Swiss-Prot record:
It catalyses: 2 Fe(II)-[cytochrome c] + H2O2 + 2 H(+) = 2 Fe(III)-[cytochrome c] + 2 H2O. The gene is CCP1. Belongs to the peroxidase family. Cytochrome c peroxidase subfamily. The active site is at H49 (proton acceptor), W188 (tryptophan radical intermediate). It comes from Saccharomyces cerevisiae (strain ATCC 204508 / S288c). Heme b binds at H172. One of its GO terms (cellular component) is mitochondrial matrix. Destroys radicals which are normally produced within the cells and which are toxic to biological systems. GO terms for biological process: cellular response to oxidative stress; hydrogen peroxide catabolic process; response to reactive oxygen species. Keywords: Heme, Hydrogen peroxide, Iron, Metal-binding, Mitochondrion, Organic radical, Oxidoreductase, Peroxidase, Phosphoprotein, Transit peptide. This is Cytochrome c peroxidase, mitochondrial. GO terms for molecular function: cytochrome-c peroxidase activity; heme binding; metal ion binding; peroxidase activity. Binds 1 heme b (iron(II)-protoporphyrin IX) group per subunit. It is found in: Mitochondrion matrix; Mitochondrion intermembrane space. The chain holds residues 71 to 361 of 361 of the full protein. It is an enzyme of class 1 (oxidoreductase).
């Protein structure tokens, strides 16, 4: 399969910056969701779930086609809870009907990271909506109850190496797990809508205890009220992953730089960009614009 990026007709930087500002302004306005965590964390989870179906072997899945609008994908049990992020985006799409679904779902993720004071993420336009029979089947997204060997093997399918996987996993400092969505309960840290390396710091410094939650699943719990999934705790069990966790716990800037590259790569996997396509855009935050 070859998916070639095609810029929405006649659009440029200024057009996509208006759609960024529309999302950022509504993120500020709708601050009450999920006991005042707001919508930022479920929007970067949605951008990762629409990209995380990709398979490097035959180029199916990925962000390009925006197939999450179709029932088979929207109803995947792995996507429980992301309907909240899709309904947040629906008024923005009605206001800007020219943007493709893939571009809006990935730009929602870039916007949230930047507005939660994370790194700038360069983003490229041009995903094109494809037909319902191109919707990937359920079951391509990862399980939470596994170990380090599983995480490593799983992410090889998305062409991600150990540094990229540990950097990507730093996004679990955002938001929280919800018992009715995944069968796990609790936050990973104290700062759940500010982008930071606190996940790595908690993993190395908290006293964790393996307990069973109300959905009868095991998870690691700390005396401070934080939790870690089996797949998160993995990162300190494996020797290769633990050296990178220690590097990011001691250098916030290197974590920001490595996340930015790996999150842009995630969102662009499977897409061919023509050599005459525009450069990646870097959008300004509302704060840098004084809005
Ligand atoms: C082996 C890899 C991963 C697994 C098993 C996993 C698992 C989970 C689970 C079980 C939840 C809870 C969902 C809920 O109950 O609402 C969650 C939430 C979340 N995940 Fe992951 N995840 C993985 C990788 C990632 C990556 C690569 C990113 C982002 C780059 C990410 C970002 C998030 C965010 C921000 C949330 C918070 C959602 C919210 O607060 O509503 N995850 N993850």
């Amino acid at each position: 399969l070859v998916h070639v990026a095609s810029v929405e007709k006649g659009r440029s930087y200024e057009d996509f910056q208006k759609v960024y500002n529309a999302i950022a302004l509504k993120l500020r306005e709708d601050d009450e969701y999920d006991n005042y965590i707001g919508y930022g964390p479920v929007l970067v989870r949605l951008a990762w779930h629409i990209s995380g179906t990709w398979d490097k072997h035959d180029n199916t899945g990925g962000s390009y086609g925006g197939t999450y609008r179709f029932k088979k994908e929207f109803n995947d049990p792995s996507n429980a809870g992301l309907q909240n992020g899709f309904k947040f985006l629906e008024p923005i799409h009605k206001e800007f009907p020219w943007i493709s679904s893939g571009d809006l779902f990935s730009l929602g993720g870039v916007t949230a990271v930047q507005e939660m004071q994370g790194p700038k993420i360069p983003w490229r336009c041009g995903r094109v909506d494809t037909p319902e029979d191109t919707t990937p089947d359920n079951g391509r997204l990862p399980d939470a109850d596994k170990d380090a060997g599983y995480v490593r093997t799983f992410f090889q399918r998305l062409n991600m190496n150990d540094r990229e996987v540990v950097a990507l996993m730093g996004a679990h400092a955002l938001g929280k797990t919800h018992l009715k969505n995944s069968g796990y309960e609790g936050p990973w840290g104290a700062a759940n809508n500010v982008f930071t390396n606190e996940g790595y710091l908690n993993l190395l410094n908290e006293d964790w205890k393996l307990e069973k939650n109300d959905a009868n699943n095991e998870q690691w719990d700390s005396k401070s009220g934080y939790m870690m999934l089996p797949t998160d705790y993995s990162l300190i069990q494996d020797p290769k992953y633990l050296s990178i966790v220690k590097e990011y716990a001691n250098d916030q800037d290197k974590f920001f730089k490595d996340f930015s590259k790996a999150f842009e790569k995630l969102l662009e996997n499977g897409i061919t960009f023509p050599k005459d396509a525009p450069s990646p855009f870097i959008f300004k935050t509302l704060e840098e614009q004084g809005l």
